[PDB]
Amino acid sequence: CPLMVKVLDAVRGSPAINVAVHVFRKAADDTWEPFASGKTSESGELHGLTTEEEFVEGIYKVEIDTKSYWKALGISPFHEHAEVVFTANDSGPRRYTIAALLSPYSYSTTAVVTN
């Protein structure tokens, strides 16, 4: 709801389906604590990661497990994963979409923050 992830495949021109995504939140001791996770759907989307109540201001890391995705397709990839690290703020749009476009040796990511 307040945090959605969408993953696209630039080789096949398709959603990136069944990609593991792990979200972490930075703790007071500066370590990454697990926050939410899932696998992208047939549409390349992962919804329901968190709720407005739980998604408080803080520093979050979204890890997209790109290496396993490419290995499953038989394509040798460069990255171990794609990592998106950002601060969530309450004076900004209410909904965060993290979009990632994947190629074997490249990835691009953007944030769409609305409301």
Added chain:
Amino acid sequence: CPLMVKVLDAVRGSPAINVAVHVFRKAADDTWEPFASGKTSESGELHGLTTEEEFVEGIYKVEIDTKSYWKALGISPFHEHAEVVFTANDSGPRRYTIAALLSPYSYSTTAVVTN
């Protein structure tokens, strides 16, 4: 329905709203004939450009009027527009989404072809 366009703004982290989009189809004499057009919605999307009946195999050009978009925001851009040129084929997924991510001096585009 068979052809959708989605445009995102990498400076603001938002949909690119009210961007003019012109679609052309290559004619027998190799000229670009107007096919469909519109402006992106509040979600950065342009739906209803064509129908399955009209969207036959052929070469299509999607022109996204990025220069006017940036000028309206007071940002000096590099490109006159972004152009996406592709062949539509019936042996491929039925729905075409042309996605574009815009910055003043760069743009990225991908095709998501499903069904």
Added chain:
Amino acid sequence: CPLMVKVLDAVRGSPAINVAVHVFRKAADDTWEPFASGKTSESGELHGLTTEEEFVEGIYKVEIDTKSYWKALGISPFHEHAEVVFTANDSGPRRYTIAALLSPYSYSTTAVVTN
């Protein structure tokens, strides 16, 4: 020298070698007139397209023949080509590098403008 093109392959993580590039300039009658052409080298670069003297103010189109590139690698890509359209030298002479990163269903392009 004043206009250089660099092309990278996001599947292999390599320069995109032997990519054909055609440059056009918009004429007074609003047609695209041939201006220069060449092919990328082993480093993915194309130098020597023009000179400061010939590269006058105007609207230029750099067409990168991505479809032929992918087909030769056994990939049936989405786009016919990547086109980069821009006004050049309207504030006086500048040096332009057009960079493109290629995937079968996506491309990204940026400009580096100096002087």
Added chain:
Amino acid sequence: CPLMVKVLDAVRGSPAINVAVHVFRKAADDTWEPFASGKTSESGELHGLTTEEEFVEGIYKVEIDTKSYWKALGISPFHEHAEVVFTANDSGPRRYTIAALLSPYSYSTTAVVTN
């Protein structure tokens, strides 16, 4: 030499100058150990991080301090940094160029691997 970083600014169409870059290598205990650091030059490039001798096989993280870059330009960006994580030299020595293209709410990264 074996590891170079190039950073471009998609808003200004320029090299991204004075960007801090920190490189880490995963140690036997699974922690990220400092490996090398530096700042991009006037050309957006960072050379001399390491040598063929010191750049042994391993998992490396290249952290590009994009937030500090944008803040100094008066832009409040989305990401804390851009992180590029990859296994290096597991098939023998190679030369790695990590390229990043930066916008306030987006970044793209690619790798060029030679030898």
